[PDB]
């Protein structure tokens, strides 16, 4: 069960982390970090920019040199180190979860049970792959012995968002380290604090200097320095589709670095008339409203078959009114604030567009309170595909409900988007479960559930929701570069 | 199009096949081979025994020596040779299918469409794996470079039954050759003829001598010579459970040769009340009656939920009366004879036990015609678990129908047998499909179908229905012997 | 046997290939295609541009729709169709090899033995993977059944160069088709002719319309239409590093399409004093001069240990003087022309830079003949790392020889380039073979050989020599898009 | 560095372990356990027999039932439990290592550094595979969705020897538990004590009752009860070739249970004239004399090329005289006793046969001391292939040195044995390293080293040295049973 959050949080790790030391920014500038529930400043953090990135990339390159400790270390030992890191996150779990709740506007019990539990499980999963990343021996033509090495890619720039700050930090470093790479991470400017605490734990677990470097700062400065850097071998980014395009173009213009992207979505959740309604209502509701709707996988287009549509709407509206808004550290609060003013305004503007374009406002639809970025949970019905709320990622607590009559029609409508991160299907019919899931152009498809993410599974997007997969067996091979070695011999035998 | 069968077949390949030559038996003895529909002798074949097997094993060992053509040949070339073999089977498809129909008591159209098509597809599948059987490179502890080789096992003895003589011959040689082994095949005494034709095609395709050797003859003579042989590395057997036990014990007493077994069954087919009855009735019917019930996977315990049981019985009985018995080469005939007198009598005896022990005879139940081993298609209802017909593999056209009320009860009853080759489930419920299939102790579980066998799928038994898998990715690695090579180096890098 | 080439080739396939039909260009324009040995026009070809590409992408999308013949076809059948295609290439092997020799300036005997043999082997390899591309089932946390599908990516745009026109066409289509994709291929403007013949064979083998579409034309027109296209899921490119950058940036600006690139090189070949000199001299010589030096993998920096350097130079110079230049269809000719005027001039310019910057001209160094783009085989010694000939890809018959004393120095010098496609090591020492190959930042490393490329091996570049691998097991999974399907169940069992 | 051993060892776990409780033997009998260095009784242990085995198998079957805690537990959690077990072995390392040294006649510092370190590393390796054992989804022919489950095999009987009692216990349970099986382990009657202490740790780590059951006792009683048991799904055995034959025959006669065997060896170590002699002398020496020669992989035929043979002999004899015999807990002692009187006598008898058959005794050759089973380290030269010491596994500190002149001759001689566990090659030549290792019929082949065993590598024997592999990726799939599930659907798409 869940301890009381800390309150009197004193901050200690506020600097740039390079070669297991803490540096001031080269410019000397700092930037403030705020609690979105109260709008109060938590602390100031060193403002990393291009010159700080260059120092970090240099440290990461040195630590990846042939003969260095990280390169010559047993793979089994990289595994041990990743597990020791997980142990230290268990020790510091109350601190981290408190810190994440304060900085990210996140409900404490969720930060403590879901995010932190996830952080630990991800690292344990990663630790186990370290010495199980293998190459091949290949029966090629002619008198040769041929094998492949699954080498690390090298220096990996890793740029991450503010919605699950610590979990996303570990989704990046875990697999990269497991495969033997070195990294330069750029936490979101809104949420650098848990990442910086992780720096102290990295050094304490015993990772060689240079293996993890962490540069807080802004996007078009520190972020763009990473994507354009001539000595970064690979960039991995989770964020907005818009910035993902800039990353890919920067990668092409500079040194053709490898790119993986996870870009958000407009995921459809399809409820057929033969489905278990109770189960479907709850999963679809959580699917869209979790963490104030700030999930990449939000079930933000809910298609419900005509014969059950009015009932589904009624039950969804009723479910959406059971929230207590407030400070996410306060017991009884069940909905926190949006992350910052930019997102707050983006959401209100999209809610306004829904009213304007004729969607039916069923509940909520405006701000709440007079401190922090709170929006009432909002449901819209009679949404049609041409509306802004049906096409654009809102990233706030706003559900769209739409009706359909035909199986073929709803598949087409589900697929009619540049997005493809995830999808949900609710049905009792075997054939529909298998065939509809095959037809949906989405990287994860849930049947009779939603938002089920686990470290064993590959995760990522079709189309403009992403390139590559993370986690699972398939994610790990993304953090390797394959080398083929072919050795002439006098005579080959099978 | 199914062509007209040949008649008046002249036989040519009647000898023992060793080093791509045809040999008389060492003893000089021959044995007769019959058409079971007519009881007429087709021809005589050289009778292989221990001394013939020894010659065949010597050939197979020589052809497997380091530096030999078959060991030094490109893996891709083993692939090409398997495909060329498939091309020759297409060329000779009418001859082979006729020959199989005559020698095996098999319906011609099925021999031509299913068996021969199967033969060609199996070989094409196998051909493609040849140069895709790969080892690993392994990030082991310490300053070493380590790799594995997936070598062939070596000389493989392969003993096969009379129900699908040609298909089973290719299920054995295809994967063994693909992986680079040499073999000594022992066709069933009832059905040596298509196998011996295959000898001519093997030579004609261009396989080096010694790579396939074929020894017709009896079980406790030629068959047991193989299982006890001190220079056979591996035995693979398809047949009766009883003989499978002898194979395994002979393997232990002699040289600890590797063993794989496929041993027949008493497969349950479970029909829940929520199933599509039309689909279920036909699949369950074919599932038990195909090839005069002479299928290892026969759906020989049909469990039907209480509420639909009487209707299921009525429809199954009605379906079982639509057969025309006779010579399987004659158009219009839809049921041929049992393979020989021993099986004929085994079946009549088991039918008699069903009457005696109180099962309800719904139709058939006795012999037919005045030449050849024909048995009327027989259905028994109100079968209970203690009866001989519910426990023993009958291997004839005899269906058992049983009722159940409880989900847990039927899973337990399904699993309550030493057999475990296959099982069928018929339901419209997603949860039942997944969970019941997980709970059944059977190697292949079909959902809303039955008897669907394909070269891409691993196939074989739980419990006393087998050891190992055949075909698919998994089958192939069981025709390899893994070697680990570990090389000291001055310094390892990831 | 190498047959006599054809002469007086009559051309038939000169159009744009879409939905298994031949189309005029939308503009009506045509462009000429030349024989580079004679400078004579061979024929004119329809000039594809953006509007043609759009038609081709529409066809490829339609053929990829759920329920279409190519999507519902058995994977094994995609395999059979690829093999049938290989059979037709064998039938048409003299025509194709002649055609390639005429259009590409390629030595006929090499076109007939190496390129065409390669073409056939690549397709056979690909055919075999089709029904062996598999997903996973995953023991994820919680009460779920989870599996992955290895789906095709979808519509793949494929842009290819003029050095191995037919081989590169099949390296692209073979794996894409094996995995179930549809494609739009853009042959190099210099060399469209064998590709267009392949169109006729594709139709004749029985591929559904829309599965391969082929658009001849120029780069910044047709090529750039492909890379910017909003409905192309993936672009695959082989060519110059410069254009590769444009492809990657276009992919980012447009629809974030997946990208794979193979970009040429400046591959080092390192000869240690303990090496077999005879073997090393010949491999290094072929390694740089093959196909008039127009190989991506050309061994264009030859590092030779100080103690054997002068002898290595002497023997290399002697080897480089044994060529007869002329028309590559004429018996006895052992060196054909460069592909076109642009390359011709690029090479002469780089040769001139070598003289200017102080390298020692050992032989050749200027043009030959009075028609067609012939350059004398040229060797430079005392080359140092700062020279243009040591840094830039020359793509002509020009060898650079350089000396080294230290193991560490030469590894560093080898790696000091933005390129990383391949490398060669020549030594008798086990430790050097393993450790030096691990240290070289190159995608393929040869030990005591060079230029050994086979369909079973993954192939591609480190750093700015590429992204992704082609062929082998690894190449195939890069023509798949992974989908995770997670189904809620009542209770999971292991 | 190495703590002082404990001395005053009080024993606590002396009983049979079933369902996480301690039971008296059903008969009430106990058997004594001795310290081989002193011949003193350490304690008495409950004597398990057939009826105790039956209780253990019943517990293991119950704990493997569908819906049981072990079956429904997350795979990731099986991993956590295996790591927690490793942590408890780290806590109890001094106790365990002391206990192993006392009971097994093992040098304490080796028990503490090598065996215990190995125990821990094995478990960590296993723990990581738990949630990475995956099945497949398969693009089979026709309108079906097909997947496989890698299920556990079920109840696994595991019979182990006295040479590495704890390490062998964990080599068995680690992989079996990781894959989700339940076990019944039968420790060697000489060395039950560390295994029984492991019982307490299993219960303390939190494994459900019935998952590990441990039955001490004799071979033909408790051992044979396991191999013949009608409800054991699989037997895994490490021991004598003779008993391995009995296991395989019992498996066939009873219920056709799956069998894996690791059976000892007569491994050849080949030193070519071009090898590094210093390195070779030491590795070959350790390779045969480690743990008083009681290693399955002992380098017990040392082939040395003629030109370096006399020098190799001289240096090997000199190396063999640097031992201090005595109590293995006493500092300065570098050779302990043989395990018991039976082995002691077997070794003296084989040493006698060497003298008798004409081998040249270079040093040692008789007993030492007057308490405990000590044999002087013995070297024999001029050994020829017909001698008993060249053919039979001695399992004592006895090295055989033999000469060879020809490469082909020495490969033949190396392979001329029913054994094939391991082999060593010492050479500076690349071609020899690769080709000779390919030609040797041995499951592990070391190049320029020996006895390098790591958890990432598959381990086991060719021919009569074993069936199956342990550890590595390949070992784990041996503890799974594959199930294929095929589900009819309306229409399949790629
Ligand atoms: N998929 C998801 O989970 C989502 C998560 C969050 C928002 N998602 C979506 O994006 C919108 C805007 O949020 P923002 O916060 O602006 O995201 P950005 O994509 O900008 O922030 C992502 C990271 O990129 C760094 N960054 C910014 N500009 C950069 C540049 N030019 N070069 C390099 N880097 C740059 C930046 O500092 C941060 O660390 C949200 O409303 C969501 O729709 C989806
Ligand atoms: C959106 C539906 C709510 C489900 C709650 C949840 O665990 N979510 C919801 C959603 C925001 C999400 C998680 C968990 C993670 O591990 C995630 C990891 C990566 C991306 C999103 C994640
Ligand atoms: Mg932004
Ligand atoms: Mg019999
Ligand atoms: Mg250009
Ligand atoms: Mg014994």
mmCIF file of C-alpha atoms and ligand atoms in Angstrom, chain A residues 106 110 114-115 118-119 122 163-164 167-168 171 238 262 283-291 293-299 395 421 446 450-454 459 470, ligand 2:
data_model
loop_
_atom_site.group_PDB
_atom_site.id
_atom_site.type_symbol
_atom_site.label_atom_id
_atom_site.label_comp_id
_atom_site.label_asym_id
_atom_site.label_seq_id
_atom_site.Cartn_x
_atom_site.Cartn_y
_atom_site.Cartn_z
ATOM 1 C CA UNK A 106 1.185 13.842 -11.407
ATOM 2 C CA UNK A 110 0.105 6.808 -9.429
ATOM 3 C CA UNK A 114 2.642 2.869 -11.610
ATOM 4 C CA UNK A 115 5.580 5.115 -12.700
ATOM 5 C CA UNK A 118 7.419 0.654 -14.102
ATOM 6 C CA UNK A 119 10.869 2.245 -13.738
ATOM 7 C CA UNK A 122 11.979 -1.778 -17.077
ATOM 8 C CA UNK A 163 4.561 13.372 -19.264
ATOM 9 C CA UNK A 164 6.433 10.409 -17.774
ATOM 10 C CA UNK A 167 9.934 6.340 -16.830
ATOM 11 C CA UNK A 168 10.923 7.767 -20.273
ATOM 12 C CA UNK A 171 13.057 3.474 -21.294
ATOM 13 C CA UNK A 238 9.987 10.798 -27.834
ATOM 14 C CA UNK A 262 7.995 7.864 -30.778
ATOM 15 C CA UNK A 283 -10.986 0.753 -20.193
ATOM 16 C CA UNK A 284 -11.976 3.358 -22.730
ATOM 17 C CA UNK A 285 -12.427 5.932 -19.957
ATOM 18 C CA UNK A 286 -8.989 5.249 -18.350
ATOM 19 C CA UNK A 287 -7.559 4.978 -21.878
ATOM 20 C CA UNK A 288 -8.248 8.613 -22.585
ATOM 21 C CA UNK A 289 -8.225 10.372 -19.116
ATOM 22 C CA UNK A 290 -5.146 8.874 -17.452
ATOM 23 C CA UNK A 291 -2.628 11.474 -16.213
ATOM 24 C CA UNK A 293 -5.076 12.907 -20.758
ATOM 25 C CA UNK A 294 -1.301 13.353 -21.200
ATOM 26 C CA UNK A 295 -0.638 9.858 -22.660
ATOM 27 C CA UNK A 296 0.713 9.239 -26.129
ATOM 28 C CA UNK A 297 -1.652 6.270 -26.397
ATOM 29 C CA UNK A 298 -4.821 8.113 -25.321
ATOM 30 C CA UNK A 299 -7.944 6.512 -26.722
ATOM 31 C CA UNK A 395 -3.242 15.897 -24.768
ATOM 32 C CA UNK A 421 0.545 4.602 -32.261
ATOM 33 C CA UNK A 446 -5.412 -4.103 -27.477
ATOM 34 C CA UNK A 450 -6.418 -0.793 -23.205
ATOM 35 C CA UNK A 451 -3.199 0.908 -22.020
ATOM 36 C CA UNK A 452 -1.489 -2.391 -21.151
ATOM 37 C CA UNK A 453 2.215 -1.633 -21.565
ATOM 38 C CA UNK A 454 4.888 -4.122 -20.401
ATOM 39 C CA UNK A 459 6.283 -0.526 -28.422
ATOM 40 C CA UNK A 470 11.281 0.207 -27.954
HETATM 41 C C1 LIG E 2 -3.568 6.006 -21.184
HETATM 42 C C2 LIG E 2 -4.332 4.936 -20.455
HETATM 43 C C3 LIG E 2 -4.103 4.925 -18.981
HETATM 44 C C4 LIG E 2 -3.444 3.665 -18.460
HETATM 45 C C5 LIG E 2 -2.500 3.916 -17.306
HETATM 46 C C6 LIG E 2 -1.055 3.668 -17.667
HETATM 47 O O1 LIG E 2 -0.382 2.881 -17.039
HETATM 48 N N1 LIG E 2 -0.553 4.365 -18.716
HETATM 49 C C7 LIG E 2 -1.330 5.257 -19.575
HETATM 50 C C8 LIG E 2 -0.315 5.880 -20.532
HETATM 51 C C9 LIG E 2 -0.187 7.398 -20.422
HETATM 52 C C10 LIG E 2 0.952 5.123 -20.211
HETATM 53 C C11 LIG E 2 0.776 4.331 -19.100
HETATM 54 C C12 LIG E 2 1.806 3.583 -18.545
HETATM 55 C C13 LIG E 2 3.039 3.572 -19.134
HETATM 56 O O2 LIG E 2 3.931 2.588 -18.863
HETATM 57 C C14 LIG E 2 3.277 4.313 -20.322
HETATM 58 C C15 LIG E 2 4.503 4.242 -21.026
HETATM 59 C C16 LIG E 2 4.682 4.918 -22.190
HETATM 60 C C17 LIG E 2 3.672 5.701 -22.711
HETATM 61 C C18 LIG E 2 2.474 5.804 -22.071
HETATM 62 C C19 LIG E 2 2.227 5.110 -20.862
#
